Write a protein that binds this ligand. Sequence first.
Ligand SMILES: Cn1cnc(Cn2c(=O)nc(Nc3cc4cn(C)nc4cc3Cl)n(Cc3cc(F)c(F)cc3F)c2=O)n1
Ligand SMILES: Cn1cnc(Cn2c(=O)nc(Nc3cc4cn(C)nc4cc3Cl)n(Cc3cc(F)c(F)cc3F)c2=O)n1
Lengths: 298, 298
Amino acid sequence: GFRKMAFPSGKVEGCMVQVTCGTTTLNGLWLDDTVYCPRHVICTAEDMLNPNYEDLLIRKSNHSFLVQAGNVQLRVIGHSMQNCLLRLKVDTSNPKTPKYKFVRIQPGQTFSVLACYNGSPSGVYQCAMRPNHTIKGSFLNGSCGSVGFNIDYDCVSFCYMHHMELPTGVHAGTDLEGKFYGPFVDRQTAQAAGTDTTITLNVLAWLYAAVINGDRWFLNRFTTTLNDFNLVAMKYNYEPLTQDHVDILGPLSAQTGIAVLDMCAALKELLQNGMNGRTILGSTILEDEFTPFDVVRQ
Amino acid sequence: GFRKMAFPSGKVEGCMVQVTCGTTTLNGLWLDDTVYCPRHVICTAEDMLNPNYEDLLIRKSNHSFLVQAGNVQLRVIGHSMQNCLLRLKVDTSNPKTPKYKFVRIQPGQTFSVLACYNGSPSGVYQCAMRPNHTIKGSFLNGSCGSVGFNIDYDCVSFCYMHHMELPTGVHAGTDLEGKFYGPFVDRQTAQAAGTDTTITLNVLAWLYAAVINGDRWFLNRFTTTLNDFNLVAMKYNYEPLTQDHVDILGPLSAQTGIAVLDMCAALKELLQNGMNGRTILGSTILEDEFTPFDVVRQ
Ligand SMILES: Cn1cnc(Cn2c(=O)nc(Nc3cc4cn(C)nc4cc3Cl)n(Cc3cc(F)c(F)cc3F)c2=O)n1
Ligand SMILES: Cn1cnc(Cn2c(=O)nc(Nc3cc4cn(C)nc4cc3Cl)n(Cc3cc(F)c(F)cc3F)c2=O)n1
């Protein structure tokens, strides 16, 4: 019974606000007395290609910022720019602020997204940071500033602030210090992501999950070293497997009785021969956004 | 970017409590001054096969119910049984109760699930009521009493309270009046649902979703009648299509400009010739847990 599940979103929902500059508007994140939002909000339509953010910013007063939390207008007391984020100081502390921290997630790791429009939460889903530092999100116009997060105990680890859609339909954004994931810049120019690779640790977890679910037609009796598997994997644009990843897969290996390198030998034959029309957990494509942690939990 | 998306769960998270009788514990739903929970909580481990709930309930008083809303304890002031649910009147009106309704959902309709573990939310995901009145959910031990719901403009429509997992790994529960979906009874005995069917109206809406998102390869120049299509549907364990179904699909037909019976002809070809190892909206099976409403909203 494996499926993508999001963390409950309530702790983030009480932090979503709307931020408007003139006629340009997007989502912002209200923690304590600070509102975080993409600095792109200070662009007019003409500014959106080739903006000079330091010029646009110095030309702004606090009153230019219209910050709305539901029915309530909050007043910007002060404002500073931090990389590609604005930090708006505001006259009131959010009573709903959860315990939180700002983290920089790593490729292969998952998080929940609260997709938001004009400061209003719309939906929640899980997705993963890709090796090429984009995310395959589900985002419409007005979603700029929507936030990605994980929850451990009662602490929300914010890790993603949505900025833009790339021409291929994938998405780019920043951490909550405003540093972009990947080689992107916040301008309305056509930017291409590098070629993507498959998250091997997660494909391996998925194969383990399929074995736990009773499907083992892809297992074989070949052996491989880590080095020889990594050489094959890179020829098929799969990420090489580190020994840390082998350690991460330890619990699934012990539960199923299939040594990590033996599952790699299964994967190797799948990569070289394909699936001869067979399916795994019902699909002909190897899923790579289900983490070992997700498998173990479900 | 088209994926299953759950409603933001904040309004439901504020209603989740833990209910314990002796050592038996599960989740309850706290609305105004009432906690709703499965009556199975009044079972000792020895009672859980073939219990007599009328017998067990008369032997308890308000004191025997321990209700915890996080750190706070709520005092039970009264109690009664309604079908397979207990209604516990409490001390305190939940200050966080949203605008809400209780609805009974029909087969093929979708809802979000807030999976909970002994009173604490842990995950959220979208699923559907199967034609055979079970749910293909993701529920672990301790999830009894978790709730399913939809949201329409600040009003939460509760439609499902989780009770149990069947031998096949699917799930069974009640509406918020305590009446089970399907042929099931709340006791720890092996029970089976009827044979399931694929939700034709949902597959068709998902094919429209694909057309809108650019996936056009499965279309053909052909067309079919309702009666001939249903001859194919029965042979492949799909639900028969009705004119109401066709009427429901009108807006999706208009937006894409593909007549409904034209999409049925494409579906008939997909069922008969299988897919070519190609994908529709990223998946390699015909998805049937998106309603026409879901496709529009996304
Ligand atoms: C299809 N899609 C998927 N994700 C996105 C996110 N996204 C967005 O929501 N808005 C953007 N531009 C704006 C236009 C506005 C018009 N008004 C009146 N107000 C607006 C505010 C914004 Cl932010 N963009 C484009 C974009 C946003 C950036 F932050 C950036 F650095 C470069 C960009 F090209 C956008 O991608 N849309
Ligand atoms: C793996 N899984 C998938 N869904 C479920 C839901 N589920 C559940 O969470 N609990 C159940 N039995 C209990 C045992 C308890 C032990 N303690 C200390 N407290 C307990 C409370 C419960 Cl409810 N069940 C079984 C079950 C629950 C019912 F409500 C019912 F009518 C029949 C049943 F067989 C269960 O399925 N677990």
